[PDB]
Homo-oligomer: A and B are copies of this chain.
Amino acid sequence: SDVEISDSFEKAMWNHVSQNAARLTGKFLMTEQFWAELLQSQPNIPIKSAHIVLHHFNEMMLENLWKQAMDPDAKLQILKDLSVPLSYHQRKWILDNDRLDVALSLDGYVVSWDIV
């Protein structure tokens, strides 16, 4: 997989996730069409492939979902749906920043969360 995504396009992808946090389930976030919506948004892009953008998100950006400045309820619900584990460091980061105590399963999967 020889794919090179620019940092500006990564930022655009994170903004595309954040603005649609209210309507993003886990399954929809991983569909090519959700990213094709981002590709359709900006013309003057020489190469547009929703398949490639989705692969880049799944391979290089999903791990960084916790650190993202978006709605914390939507973020954690996505982390639960896709079964993305939170480490101790990421869990305490979420507590100290998004002000949420996350109840995790044994494997580290997001099970629930409480406020402050």
Contact = CB atoms under 8 A, between A and B. Distances in A.
Interface stretch (A4-12, A22-30, A68-76): A4-12
Count copies of this chain in the complex.
2
Contacts of A49: 1-4, 47, 49, 52
A5 B46 contact: yes
Contacts of A50: 2
Residue picked from A2, A8, A36, A52, most chain B C-beta under 10 Å = A2
Given A1-B49, A8-B46, A12-B46, 4 more contacts: A2-B36, A3-B49, A4-B49, A6-B47
Interface of A: 1-6, 8-9, 12, 32, 36, 39, 44-53
Closest 10 CB pairs of A and B: A9-B46, A4-B48, A6-B46, A47-B47, A3-B49, A2-B50, A2-B51, A2-B49, A49-B52, A5-B47
